[PDB]
Amino acid sequence: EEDKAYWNKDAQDALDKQLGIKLREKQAKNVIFFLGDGMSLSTVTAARIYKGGLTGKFEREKISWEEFDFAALSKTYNTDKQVTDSAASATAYLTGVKTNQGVIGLDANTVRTNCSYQLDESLFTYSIAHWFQEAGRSTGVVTSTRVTHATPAGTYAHVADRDWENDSDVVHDREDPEICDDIAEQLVFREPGKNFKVIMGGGRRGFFPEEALDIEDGIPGEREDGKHLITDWLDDKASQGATASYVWNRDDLLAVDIANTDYLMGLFSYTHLDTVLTRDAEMDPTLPEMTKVAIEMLTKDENGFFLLVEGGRIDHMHHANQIRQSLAETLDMEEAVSMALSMTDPEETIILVTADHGHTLTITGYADRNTDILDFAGISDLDDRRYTILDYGSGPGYHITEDGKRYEPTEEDLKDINFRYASAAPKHSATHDGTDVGIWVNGPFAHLFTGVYEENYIPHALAYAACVGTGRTFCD
Numbered sequence: 001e002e003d004k005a006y007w008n009k010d011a012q013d014a015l016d017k018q019l020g021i022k023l024r025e026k027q028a029k030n031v032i033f034f035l036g037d038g039m040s041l042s043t044v045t046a047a048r049i050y051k052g053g054l055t056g057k058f059e060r061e062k063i064s065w066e067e068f069d070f071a072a073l074s075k076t077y078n079t080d081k082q083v084t085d086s087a088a089s090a091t092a093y094l095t096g097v098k099t100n101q102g103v104i105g106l107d108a109n110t111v112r113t114n115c116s117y118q119l120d121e122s123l124f125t126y127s128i129a130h131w132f133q134e135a136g137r138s139t140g141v142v143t144s145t146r147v148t149h150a151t152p153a154g155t156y157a158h159v160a161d162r163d164w165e166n167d168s169d170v171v172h173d174r175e176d177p178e179i180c181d182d183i184a185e186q187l188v189f190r191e192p193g194k195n196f197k198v199i200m201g202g203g204r205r206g207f208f209p210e211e212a213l214d215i216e217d218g219i220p221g222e223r224e225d226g227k228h229l230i231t232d233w234l235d236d237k238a239s240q241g242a243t244a245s246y247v248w249n250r251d252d253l254l255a256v257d258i259a260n261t262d263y264l265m266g267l268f269s270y271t272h273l274d275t276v277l278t279r280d281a282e283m284d285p286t287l288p289e290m291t292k293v294a295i296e297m298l299t300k301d302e303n304g305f306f307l308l309v310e311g312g313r314i315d316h317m318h319h320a321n322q323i324r325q326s327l328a329e330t331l332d333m334e335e336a337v338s339m340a341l342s343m344t345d346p347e348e349t350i351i352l353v354t355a356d357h358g359h360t361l362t363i364t365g366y367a368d369r370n371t372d373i374l375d376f377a378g379i380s381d382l383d384d385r386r387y388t389i390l391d392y393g394s395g396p397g398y399h400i401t402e403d404g405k406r407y408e409p410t411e412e413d414l415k416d417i418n419f420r421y422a423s424a425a426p427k428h429s430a431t432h433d434g435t436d437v438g439i440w441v442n443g444p445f446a447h448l449f450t451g452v453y454e455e456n457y458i459p460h461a462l463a464y465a466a467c468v469g470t471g472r473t474f475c476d
């Protein structure tokens with residue numbers, strides 16, 4: 001039982017672990033970057049307890065990346081807003097430069113929704129994936145979102161508005177698609193996108209025209225310019241004399257011949273991949289499964305590789321105050337981190353986990369230990385109605401009943417994967433949260449992450465340790 005001796009040994013052991021930390025002052029060969037979108041520190045705590053609910057450890061459970069010796073805090077404000085969107089943050093943590101809301105791979109001179117700015121190369125910021133490529137090393141990206149979503153896009157795109165995932169989105173904002181390249185285009189026609197060995201996620205819709213029909217579902221595509229970008233991608237690999245594979249389902253992914261495959265594009269949905277609690281496990285590969293295949297491919301490169309893996313729908317669930325699903329997405333990513341750790345060598349591989357920004361999730365009192373984190377906390381002493389442990393500062397969960405009272409959540413509500421937990425400030429989609437987020441790191445030079453940093457510091461430190469880019473380097 002958790003008595004005085006128990007806690008003293010628990011602590012003495014942690015101290016013993018801390019004292020035994022051996023620094024790794026050697027170049028990083030590989031860098032695996034995990035990004036939990038909208039994964040606030042509160043999401044991590046809540047998810048630790050959620051996991052504990054499955055394993056029976058409850059509040060004593062540990063999140064995989066919390067076994068790392070190095071954690072840090074990251075300040076996420078951007079050049080025009082206190083609370084960053086996913087685009088400006090991705091530009092910061094992948095290109096090393098902070099920027100305006102809605103802009104990817106361009107600096108703060110950029111005026112959002114203005115394409116001219118994406119024609120000016122002097123305004124370009126370049127990603128750690130670019131840098132790995134310039135050094136002759138392999139790159140890839142896995143995500144549960146559309147592969148043209150802001151996060152993956154930060155590794156390769158330069159656009160004046162994150163909304164421009166395909167040419168139909170450019171036209172929608174009155175811009176000229178002929179000269180304003182959309183993100184899907186940039187992934188297949190430009191560097192570094194065109195050189196990625198592995199591209200996985202969703203978003204097939206931005207890659208083929210309205211006149212064409214989707215693999216799997218037969219839904220017409222979104223492109224309005226007649227371009228079939230997947231076949232463009234395939235033709236490109238083939239004309240280089242390389243083998244390439246396009247897959248769109250789990251069985252096919254797992255059947256891929258790793259040894260004989262140079263390029264891999266796996267697009268498992270028309271749009272974002274289905275959430276953990278709604279996906280067809282037969283048809284959709286999980287985040288860890290995608291991660292495994294990505295690592296299998298990229299590790300063939302003896303000079304090293306960079307891989308971005310995003311737990312992306314964490315954010316989407318928070319936006320709808322759908323906290324149960326948000327926690328399930330989070331754990332899918334926690335499991336992916338474990339998959340990566342078991343497949344790589346920490347003496348040469350940096351594994352970093354962070355968030356782009358948080359969400360306004362809070363953990364209220366006062367439930368007893370071992371209480372399911374999604375359960376009720378107690379009854380309000382002001383209106384006599386139940387309240388949940390988890391709730392939000394912002395979102396559509398705020399609900400005044402027909403009688404003008406605070407909606408009281410039910411047992412049925414709590415079990416419902418679509419139930420929206422209460423918020424303090426009603427909004428159709430919850431805003432992001434501005435609080436500093438966490439960073440957790442293992443491997444070479446993990447001790448570059450000890451304190452509190454601006455969010456754009458991250459890739460500068462990672463470059464130093466991997467010896468890529470044009471800044472200070474360990475090999476320097």
Ligand SMILES: *[C@@H]1O[C@H](CO)[C@@H](O)[C@H](O)[C@H]1NC(C)=O
Binds near residue numbers: 114116117
């Ligand atoms: C967009 O930028 C260009 C280039 O400097 C400028 O000529 C144009 O008027 C700008 N458009 C708007 C709407 O500000």
Ligand SMILES: [Zn+2]
Binds near residue numbers: 037086356357
């Ligand atoms: Zn985000």
Ligand SMILES: [Zn+2]
Binds near residue numbers: 086145149150152312
């Ligand atoms: Zn994202």
Ligand SMILES: [Zn+2]
Binds near residue numbers: 038319
């Ligand atoms: Zn968001």
